[PDB]
Amino acid sequence: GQPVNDFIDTATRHVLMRQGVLGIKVKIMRDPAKSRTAPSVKDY
Amino acid sequence: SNEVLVLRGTLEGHNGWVTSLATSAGQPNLLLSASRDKTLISWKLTGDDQKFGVPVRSFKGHSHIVQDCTLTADGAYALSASWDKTLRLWDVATGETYQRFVGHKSDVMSVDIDKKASMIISGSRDKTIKVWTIKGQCLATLLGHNDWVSQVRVVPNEKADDDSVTIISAGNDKMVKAWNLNQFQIEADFIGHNSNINTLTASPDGTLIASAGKDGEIMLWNLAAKKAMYTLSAQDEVFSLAFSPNRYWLAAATATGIKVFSLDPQYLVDDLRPEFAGYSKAAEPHAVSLAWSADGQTLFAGYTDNVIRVWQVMTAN
């Protein structure tokens, strides 16, 4: 939805090491409350 | 040749409306009365033409007004349902609360204990028909009413409890309901009422149901057959119903008076209206409760002027 465009933030860093490279995906969701801007008888 | 009800006097000691009455079988001299003075009074009656002797005990223990009460067949215990969302089990002797039934979320409007004094049902304004032991333990929660539950009664067995344990309730959702408490499920849906059902009672044998309310329609059903029988017009609002232990009479508490009907032969036996002193006619006290005695000869009536008026059947010329 649109709450993803308003509130969550994602960052992807490729960390280069001695074997290979890895993928670091940090996804932080901030607080949305701090967004400043006849009678019948039946029987059973 | 008529069978005449005569005003035998008055029983007064309450501060609020006499909302319930219950008589005894072990001792036919005992009357338990639940009132809107948040107390129940137990009387030992000495029947004279104007006054009645001894007022035995008071049972102060309910925070808000006491709505319904019942005695046991010997007359040793009391069972009071109050607006404090609780029930209580008293000793008619000392006034000792043997147990407090705490479970409901609103005002408890009715209470009745079974034949062998071991299963205690309770109906309230939180549309909940709870079933308790005698020790204070809720073992059943029978929901089903979508409005208030004005009255819950246990139906008198005729086959000596042949595994059939039935209770009948009167909702303000304009329906009567019959529950089987052997598996805890709905067993019958009595539809037919057009307004709020104020009361309901099962006949002595255990096959007739009488439900009336605001419409003034005393509707009779057959519970053993689970089919609608008929309807008797009681005109004004009927607050309490009761079947005679011996006779085939049905006395209803109408906003005008106390209408005693017969079912065989079909006719209105009486319409009991006591003389009031200094009141307008839209200011006259009505019957809010009534209890039949152990032999069908005495009719006790709990009124709204805090006074329990009593009638006795004779035989006229």
Short mmCIF file of C-alpha atoms in Angstrom, two decimals:
data_model
loop_
_atom_site.label_atom_id
_atom_site.label_comp_id
_atom_site.label_asym_id
_atom_site.label_seq_id
_atom_site.Cartn_x
_atom_site.Cartn_y
_atom_site.Cartn_z
CA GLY A 1 0.00 0.00 0.00
CA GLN A 2 0.80 3.70 0.43
CA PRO A 3 1.86 3.32 4.13
CA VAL A 4 5.03 1.74 2.65
CA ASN A 5 5.70 4.97 0.70
CA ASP A 6 4.98 7.03 3.84
CA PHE A 7 6.54 5.10 6.75
CA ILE A 8 9.04 2.27 5.95
CA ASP A 9 12.62 3.02 4.80
CA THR A 10 14.83 0.47 3.00
CA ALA A 11 18.59 0.48 2.30
CA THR A 12 20.68 -2.13 0.46
CA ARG A 13 24.45 -2.35 1.07
CA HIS A 14 26.61 -4.97 -0.69
CA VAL A 15 29.36 -5.87 1.80
CA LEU A 16 32.55 -7.06 0.05
CA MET A 17 34.51 -9.73 1.94
CA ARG A 18 37.34 -12.25 1.34
CA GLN A 19 35.11 -15.09 0.04
CA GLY A 20 32.44 -13.11 -1.81
CA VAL A 21 30.00 -10.22 -1.47
CA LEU A 22 26.88 -10.27 0.72
CA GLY A 23 23.56 -8.43 0.64
CA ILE A 24 22.56 -6.32 3.65
CA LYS A 25 18.95 -5.10 3.45
CA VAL A 26 17.89 -2.87 6.36
CA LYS A 27 14.15 -2.07 6.49
CA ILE A 28 13.15 0.26 9.34
CA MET A 29 9.52 1.12 10.11
CA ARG A 30 9.12 4.32 12.15
CA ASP A 31 6.15 5.19 14.41
CA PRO A 32 3.10 6.45 12.39
CA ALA A 33 1.92 8.43 15.46
CA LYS A 34 5.07 10.60 15.21
CA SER A 35 4.36 11.57 11.59
CA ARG A 36 4.98 15.33 11.90
CA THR A 37 4.10 16.40 8.33
CA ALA A 38 -49.15 -16.50 14.12
CA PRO A 39 -47.02 -18.10 16.91
CA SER A 40 -44.57 -20.72 15.56
CA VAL A 41 -42.53 -23.21 17.58
CA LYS A 42 -39.21 -24.65 16.40
CA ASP A 43 -37.48 -27.69 17.95
CA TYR A 44 -33.92 -29.04 17.82
CA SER B 1 -72.09 -21.44 43.14
CA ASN B 2 -68.79 -19.52 42.97
CA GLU B 3 -65.28 -19.99 44.40
CA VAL B 4 -64.47 -16.58 45.89
CA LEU B 5 -61.11 -14.94 46.66
CA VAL B 6 -61.29 -12.69 49.78
CA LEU B 7 -58.75 -10.04 50.92
CA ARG B 8 -57.33 -11.44 54.17
CA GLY B 9 -55.22 -8.42 55.12
CA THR B 10 -51.74 -7.01 54.55
CA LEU B 11 -48.05 -7.85 55.17
CA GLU B 12 -45.89 -4.68 55.41
CA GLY B 13 -42.23 -4.29 56.42
CA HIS B 14 -40.53 -3.36 53.13
CA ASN B 15 -39.24 0.05 51.94
CA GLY B 16 -39.32 -0.75 48.21
CA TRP B 17 -41.40 -2.67 45.65
CA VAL B 18 -42.06 -6.29 46.59
CA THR B 19 -40.52 -7.72 43.39
CA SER B 20 -40.58 -11.46 44.18
CA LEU B 21 -42.27 -14.05 46.40
CA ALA B 22 -41.59 -17.73 47.22
CA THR B 23 -43.56 -20.15 49.43
CA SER B 24 -42.49 -23.33 51.26
CA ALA B 25 -43.59 -26.99 51.24
CA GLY B 26 -41.90 -28.27 54.41
CA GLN B 27 -43.35 -25.38 56.40
CA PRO B 28 -46.56 -23.79 54.98
CA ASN B 29 -46.16 -20.95 57.52
CA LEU B 30 -43.07 -19.46 55.81
CA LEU B 31 -42.95 -16.71 53.14
CA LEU B 32 -39.73 -15.37 51.55
CA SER B 33 -39.98 -11.91 49.91
CA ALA B 34 -37.33 -10.14 47.78
CA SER B 35 -37.70 -6.36 47.54
CA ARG B 36 -36.23 -3.11 46.18
CA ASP B 37 -35.02 -2.20 49.66
CA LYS B 38 -32.02 -4.42 48.87
CA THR B 39 -33.22 -6.81 51.60
CA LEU B 40 -35.26 -10.03 51.68
CA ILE B 41 -37.77 -10.58 54.50
CA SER B 42 -38.85 -14.03 55.73
CA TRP B 43 -42.23 -14.13 57.50
CA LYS B 44 -43.86 -16.67 59.86
CA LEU B 45 -47.56 -16.05 59.27
CA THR B 46 -50.38 -16.04 61.84
CA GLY B 47 -53.49 -15.61 59.67
CA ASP B 48 -55.97 -13.13 61.19
CA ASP B 49 -58.59 -10.94 59.41
CA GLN B 50 -56.52 -7.71 59.40
CA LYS B 51 -52.97 -8.34 60.68
CA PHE B 52 -50.39 -11.13 60.34
CA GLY B 53 -48.25 -11.90 63.39
CA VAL B 54 -44.50 -12.42 63.18
CA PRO B 55 -41.99 -10.96 60.65
CA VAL B 56 -39.03 -13.34 61.25
CA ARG B 57 -35.86 -12.22 59.44
CA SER B 58 -34.19 -9.60 57.23
CA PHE B 59 -31.42 -10.47 54.77
CA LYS B 60 -29.22 -7.43 54.19
CA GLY B 61 -26.35 -8.36 51.89
CA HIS B 62 -27.27 -7.13 48.42
CA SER B 63 -25.73 -3.79 47.35
CA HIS B 64 -28.53 -2.95 44.93
CA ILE B 65 -32.21 -3.97 44.84
CA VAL B 66 -33.07 -7.67 45.09
CA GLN B 67 -35.08 -8.77 42.04
CA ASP B 68 -35.99 -12.47 42.42
CA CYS B 69 -35.99 -15.12 45.20
CA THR B 70 -36.85 -18.80 45.74
CA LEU B 71 -37.12 -21.11 48.79
CA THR B 72 -36.38 -24.83 49.02
CA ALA B 73 -38.97 -27.61 49.55
CA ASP B 74 -38.14 -27.84 53.27
CA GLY B 75 -37.78 -24.07 53.75
CA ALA B 76 -34.22 -23.93 55.09
CA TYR B 77 -32.39 -21.96 52.35
CA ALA B 78 -32.94 -18.77 50.33
CA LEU B 79 -31.68 -17.87 46.83
CA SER B 80 -31.52 -14.17 45.97
CA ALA B 81 -30.70 -12.58 42.59
CA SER B 82 -29.73 -8.90 42.75
CA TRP B 83 -28.83 -5.89 40.59
CA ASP B 84 -25.30 -5.95 42.03
CA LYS B 85 -24.54 -8.52 39.29
CA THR B 86 -24.50 -11.26 41.95
CA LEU B 87 -26.60 -14.01 43.53
CA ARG B 88 -26.57 -15.28 47.15
CA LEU B 89 -27.54 -18.41 49.12
CA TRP B 90 -29.00 -17.55 52.57
CA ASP B 91 -30.12 -19.55 55.60
CA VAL B 92 -33.75 -18.59 56.38
CA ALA B 93 -32.93 -19.42 60.02
CA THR B 94 -29.91 -17.20 60.77
CA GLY B 95 -29.40 -15.13 57.60
CA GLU B 96 -26.01 -16.67 56.83
CA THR B 97 -24.84 -16.34 53.22
CA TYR B 98 -23.60 -19.87 52.48
CA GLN B 99 -22.31 -18.77 49.06
CA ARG B 100 -21.99 -15.74 46.77
CA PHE B 101 -22.59 -16.45 43.08
CA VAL B 102 -20.29 -14.02 41.21
CA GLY B 103 -20.12 -14.31 37.42
CA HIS B 104 -22.70 -12.13 35.64
CA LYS B 105 -21.73 -8.82 33.98
CA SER B 106 -25.09 -7.13 34.63
CA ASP B 107 -28.19 -7.17 36.87
CA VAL B 108 -29.45 -10.67 37.79
CA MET B 109 -33.21 -10.58 37.12
CA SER B 110 -34.27 -14.12 38.06
CA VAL B 111 -33.24 -17.32 39.88
CA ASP B 112 -34.62 -20.83 40.45
CA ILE B 113 -33.18 -24.07 41.87
CA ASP B 114 -34.13 -27.56 40.59
CA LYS B 115 -36.17 -30.28 42.33
CA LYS B 116 -33.35 -31.99 44.28
CA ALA B 117 -31.66 -28.67 45.17
CA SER B 118 -28.35 -29.22 43.34
CA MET B 119 -28.52 -27.11 40.14
CA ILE B 120 -28.97 -23.32 40.33
CA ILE B 121 -29.86 -21.38 37.15
CA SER B 122 -29.64 -17.59 36.70
CA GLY B 123 -30.86 -15.11 34.08
CA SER B 124 -29.68 -11.51 33.86
CA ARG B 125 -29.67 -8.35 31.71
CA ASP B 126 -26.38 -9.31 30.03
CA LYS B 127 -28.31 -11.86 27.89
CA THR B 128 -26.65 -14.75 29.79
CA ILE B 129 -28.35 -17.83 31.29
CA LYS B 130 -25.67 -19.22 33.63
CA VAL B 131 -25.89 -22.59 35.38
CA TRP B 132 -24.15 -23.08 38.75
CA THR B 133 -23.62 -25.82 41.34
CA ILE B 134 -24.70 -25.24 44.96
CA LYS B 135 -21.07 -24.43 45.85
CA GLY B 136 -20.91 -21.23 43.76
CA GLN B 137 -19.27 -22.73 40.67
CA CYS B 138 -20.54 -21.72 37.21
CA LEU B 139 -20.49 -24.86 35.08
CA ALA B 140 -22.57 -23.50 32.19
CA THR B 141 -22.92 -20.32 30.13
CA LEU B 142 -26.13 -20.47 28.03
CA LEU B 143 -26.13 -17.50 25.64
CA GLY B 144 -28.78 -17.13 22.93
CA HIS B 145 -30.92 -14.16 23.87
CA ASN B 146 -30.24 -11.05 21.78
CA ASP B 147 -32.08 -8.79 24.25
CA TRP B 148 -32.65 -8.96 28.04
CA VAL B 149 -33.40 -12.20 29.90
CA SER B 150 -36.39 -11.28 32.08
CA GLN B 151 -36.99 -14.68 33.69
CA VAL B 152 -35.45 -18.19 33.96
CA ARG B 153 -37.43 -21.16 35.37
CA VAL B 154 -36.81 -24.91 35.80
CA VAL B 155 -39.63 -27.09 34.42
CA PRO B 156 -41.18 -29.65 36.86
CA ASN B 157 -40.43 -33.20 35.61
CA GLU B 158 -43.23 -35.78 35.35
CA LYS B 159 -41.23 -38.94 34.58
CA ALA B 160 -39.04 -38.63 37.72
CA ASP B 161 -36.06 -37.01 35.92
CA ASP B 162 -35.63 -39.56 33.11
CA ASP B 163 -32.39 -37.90 31.87
CA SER B 164 -34.39 -34.85 30.65
CA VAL B 165 -33.27 -31.66 32.48
CA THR B 166 -35.10 -28.70 30.87
CA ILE B 167 -35.24 -24.98 31.74
CA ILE B 168 -37.47 -22.27 30.16
CA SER B 169 -36.46 -18.60 29.76
CA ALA B 170 -38.36 -15.49 28.65
CA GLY B 171 -36.37 -12.94 26.67
CA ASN B 172 -37.16 -9.33 25.85
CA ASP B 173 -36.27 -10.24 22.26
CA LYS B 174 -39.95 -11.27 22.08
CA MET B 175 -39.22 -15.01 22.39
CA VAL B 176 -39.47 -17.91 24.85
CA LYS B 177 -36.63 -20.50 24.89
CA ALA B 178 -36.34 -24.10 26.16
CA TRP B 179 -32.88 -25.43 27.06
CA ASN B 180 -31.68 -28.98 27.67
CA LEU B 181 -28.94 -28.86 30.33
CA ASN B 182 -27.67 -32.40 29.67
CA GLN B 183 -25.31 -31.21 26.92
CA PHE B 184 -26.05 -27.46 27.32
CA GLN B 185 -27.85 -26.55 24.07
CA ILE B 186 -31.08 -24.93 22.80
CA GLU B 187 -33.97 -27.45 22.58
CA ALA B 188 -36.95 -25.26 21.62
CA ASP B 189 -37.65 -21.81 20.13
CA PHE B 190 -41.09 -20.48 21.13
CA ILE B 191 -41.77 -17.49 18.78
CA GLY B 192 -45.06 -15.54 18.87
CA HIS B 193 -44.77 -12.55 21.22
CA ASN B 194 -45.04 -9.03 19.73
CA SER B 195 -43.45 -7.08 22.63
CA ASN B 196 -41.23 -7.55 25.73
CA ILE B 197 -41.89 -10.76 27.70
CA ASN B 198 -41.84 -9.85 31.42
CA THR B 199 -42.32 -13.30 32.98
CA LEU B 200 -42.73 -17.05 32.40
CA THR B 201 -43.69 -20.12 34.44
CA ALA B 202 -44.03 -23.89 33.88
CA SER B 203 -47.18 -25.77 34.95
CA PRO B 204 -46.99 -28.25 37.90
CA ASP B 205 -46.84 -31.35 35.64
CA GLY B 206 -44.19 -29.98 33.25
CA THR B 207 -45.93 -29.73 29.87
CA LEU B 208 -47.42 -26.20 29.76
CA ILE B 209 -45.73 -22.80 29.35
CA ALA B 210 -47.28 -19.41 30.17
CA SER B 211 -45.50 -16.29 28.90
CA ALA B 212 -46.79 -12.70 29.05
CA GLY B 213 -45.26 -9.25 29.00
CA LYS B 214 -46.07 -5.76 27.77
CA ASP B 215 -48.54 -6.68 25.01
CA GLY B 216 -50.94 -8.12 27.59
CA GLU B 217 -51.00 -11.47 25.78
CA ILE B 218 -50.81 -14.44 28.14
CA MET B 219 -49.57 -17.02 25.62
CA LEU B 220 -49.89 -20.73 26.41
CA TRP B 221 -47.55 -23.25 24.78
CA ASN B 222 -47.25 -27.05 25.05
CA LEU B 223 -43.63 -27.92 25.94
CA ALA B 224 -43.89 -31.73 25.87
CA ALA B 225 -45.39 -31.42 22.37
CA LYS B 226 -43.20 -28.36 21.58
CA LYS B 227 -46.07 -26.62 19.73
CA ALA B 228 -47.98 -23.36 20.29
CA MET B 229 -51.36 -23.81 22.02
CA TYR B 230 -53.11 -20.42 22.26
CA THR B 231 -53.29 -16.87 23.64
CA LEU B 232 -55.45 -15.18 26.31
CA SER B 233 -55.92 -11.39 26.21
CA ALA B 234 -54.98 -9.82 29.55
CA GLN B 235 -55.16 -6.30 28.04
CA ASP B 236 -52.59 -4.35 30.15
CA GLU B 237 -48.99 -5.26 30.98
CA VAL B 238 -48.53 -8.60 32.82
CA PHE B 239 -45.47 -8.62 35.13
CA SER B 240 -45.72 -12.04 36.81
CA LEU B 241 -47.42 -15.38 36.05
CA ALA B 242 -47.99 -18.48 38.22
CA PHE B 243 -49.83 -21.82 37.93
CA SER B 244 -51.95 -23.13 40.82
CA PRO B 245 -50.55 -26.29 42.52
CA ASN B 246 -53.94 -28.09 42.63
CA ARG B 247 -56.48 -26.19 40.47
CA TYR B 248 -56.22 -25.35 36.76
CA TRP B 249 -55.93 -21.59 37.41
CA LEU B 250 -53.56 -18.97 35.97
CA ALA B 251 -53.18 -15.74 37.98
CA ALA B 252 -51.46 -12.86 36.16
CA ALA B 253 -50.15 -9.56 37.55
CA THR B 254 -51.66 -6.82 35.31
CA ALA B 255 -50.93 -3.06 35.59
CA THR B 256 -54.57 -2.66 36.64
CA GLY B 257 -54.93 -5.61 39.03
CA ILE B 258 -54.57 -9.38 39.41
CA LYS B 259 -56.41 -11.40 36.73
CA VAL B 260 -57.15 -15.03 37.69
CA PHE B 261 -58.09 -17.14 34.62
CA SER B 262 -59.33 -20.75 34.38
CA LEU B 263 -58.25 -23.22 31.68
CA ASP B 264 -60.96 -25.90 32.16
CA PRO B 265 -63.70 -24.69 31.86
CA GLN B 266 -62.37 -21.63 29.98
CA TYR B 267 -63.41 -18.41 31.75
CA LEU B 268 -61.91 -15.51 33.75
CA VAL B 269 -62.37 -16.60 37.37
CA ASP B 270 -61.58 -13.25 39.04
CA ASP B 271 -60.01 -9.77 38.66
CA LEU B 272 -58.50 -8.80 42.02
CA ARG B 273 -58.24 -5.04 42.68
CA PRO B 274 -57.64 -3.85 46.30
CA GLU B 275 -58.89 -0.46 47.58
CA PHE B 276 -56.25 2.29 47.64
CA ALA B 277 -56.44 5.40 49.82
CA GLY B 278 -55.77 8.83 48.32
CA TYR B 279 -54.49 7.84 44.87
CA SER B 280 -55.47 8.79 41.32
CA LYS B 281 -56.32 5.93 38.93
CA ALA B 282 -53.08 6.43 36.95
CA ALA B 283 -51.31 6.36 40.32
CA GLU B 284 -52.70 3.08 41.73
CA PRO B 285 -50.13 0.42 42.75
CA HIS B 286 -50.03 -2.70 40.56
CA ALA B 287 -48.97 -6.31 41.17
CA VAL B 288 -45.28 -6.84 40.40
CA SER B 289 -45.06 -10.35 41.91
CA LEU B 290 -47.24 -13.25 43.10
CA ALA B 291 -46.73 -16.64 44.77
CA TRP B 292 -49.18 -19.54 45.20
CA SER B 293 -49.29 -21.41 48.52
CA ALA B 294 -48.68 -25.14 49.14
CA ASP B 295 -52.36 -26.20 48.83
CA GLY B 296 -53.69 -23.73 46.23
CA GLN B 297 -55.92 -22.01 48.81
CA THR B 298 -53.71 -18.96 49.43
CA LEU B 299 -52.48 -16.36 46.91
CA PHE B 300 -49.71 -13.97 48.03
CA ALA B 301 -49.13 -10.78 46.00
CA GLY B 302 -46.11 -8.47 46.14
CA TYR B 303 -47.13 -4.93 45.21
CA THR B 304 -45.48 -1.61 44.34
CA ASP B 305 -46.61 0.20 47.51
CA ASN B 306 -44.13 -2.00 49.43
CA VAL B 307 -47.02 -4.11 50.81
CA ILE B 308 -47.61 -7.87 50.34
CA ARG B 309 -51.40 -8.30 50.01
CA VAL B 310 -52.88 -11.79 50.46
CA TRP B 311 -56.04 -13.54 49.20
CA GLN B 312 -57.74 -16.82 50.19
CA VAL B 313 -60.17 -19.01 48.22
CA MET B 314 -63.59 -19.74 49.75
CA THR B 315 -66.84 -21.16 48.36
CA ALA B 316 -69.92 -18.98 47.82
CA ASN B 317 -73.66 -19.55 47.45
#
